[PDB]
Amino acid sequence: MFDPAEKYKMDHRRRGIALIFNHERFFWHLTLPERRGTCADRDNLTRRFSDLGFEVKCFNDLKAEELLLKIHEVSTVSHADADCFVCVFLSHGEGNHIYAYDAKIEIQTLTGLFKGDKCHSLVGKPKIFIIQAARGNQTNITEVDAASVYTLPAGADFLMCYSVAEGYYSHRETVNGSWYIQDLCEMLGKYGSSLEFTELLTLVNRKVSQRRVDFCKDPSAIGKKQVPCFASMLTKKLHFFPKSN
Amino acid sequence: MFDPAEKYKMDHRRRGIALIFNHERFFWHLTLPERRGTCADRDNLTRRFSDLGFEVKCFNDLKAEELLLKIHEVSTVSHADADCFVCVFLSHGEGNHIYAYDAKIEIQTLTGLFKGDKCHSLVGKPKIFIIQAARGNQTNITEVDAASVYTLPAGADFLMCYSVAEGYYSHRETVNGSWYIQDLCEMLGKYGSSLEFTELLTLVNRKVSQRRVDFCKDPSAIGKKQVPCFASMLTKKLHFFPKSN
């Protein structure tokens, strides 16, 4: 009795964990610029995910070893009584890699820890990764980075969400934060608790795509449009309806 | 007045063109196997897209020059009186590339022809690419290929749809056709004219992911699961409601 309107079962005791890895500064010998504004992104994401019932765990400027430890820890704890898992990266990236403070890490080995094989308690539950990462460039200025992180899929019941697609540019206001994360957080506030999550991400695609880039204080930043995307491997409608205490 | 339920305007005179590039056989010196069953994929897609009002144009085993000519032709004709554009590749692929009969072509240069810049008549209209392409290995049998084609995004208002994700395997029955395209076509038949198209593709993710791979006639084909994905850069809900004559 196959159902075209099947929703992920979101009636477990807890919503689940939202990891946020937040990277502002980098080891000198990496020659990567400060990401002034990333704290606004971390704080905005933390508030909006908290209001949808996530236990939000933030980590600032972890070295590779510490990041792998924290994310492995979370992968081997039980999610049996959880709706889903969210993991956010705010850093620089290149290709299949995100930057820790120290060094780059393959995204596939981070997403791999939550695959059915390796994390039984999350099988058939949504695993959502959100990635604001681009190429390290060099009061409220708008900085623009070229897209650099591949828009990779991840496995059954993963949703990979990307600030920017190949050939487009990602924008970060040094006080207000990343265009992508501002618009994501605005949509989570207005609609997080009602709209299907891919419907919401589609709103975010519209909001960010519509941001005008013809009249810029920096001339070289003109016509550098931003288009985000998501790569869905979801098998059901995903909603974050308020949980009944 | 920003609207969370905005639909793409799908009330133009014609639905639009669906290109289908169908590749069964390859130049000897490419050492690529026949794709026995791809004709079932072509015929199934042709029927289901026709019933949703597409002018379906099929091309069998085009050399690179011919394919570039046909797709450039379609890109420079006017889509002003059209709802959208669909383009399907049934071939082998590797990374950035789809195989013509002759040689490989960068997917970015095919999707590039329909970007706002280069095709004014499709600006703000959905551009949907469906790609059944994997790595060619050196009565109704099930053949299994490793995933090989990158799940690339494409630009504002593109939807890129992929038979299989990194690390998974794509299946083709030599009479019935590709698992992905069978399940896509079944869902188009039941739900094409009612469901939002990304909702439908999510059904296809469930159907294909749920196909069992533990009891196979070939032992070496066991545990080779298939998970499709889509990379959405859509900005609105997309529906293929019946057109009013």
Ligand SMILES: Oc1cc(F)ccc1CNc1ncccc1-c1ccon1
């Ligand atoms: O999507 C982007 C985004 C960028 F910023 C830059 C480039 C691509 C295209 N690459 C891929 N996309 C998806 C899965 C794999 C790749 C891949 C792997 C090895 O080379 N490419």
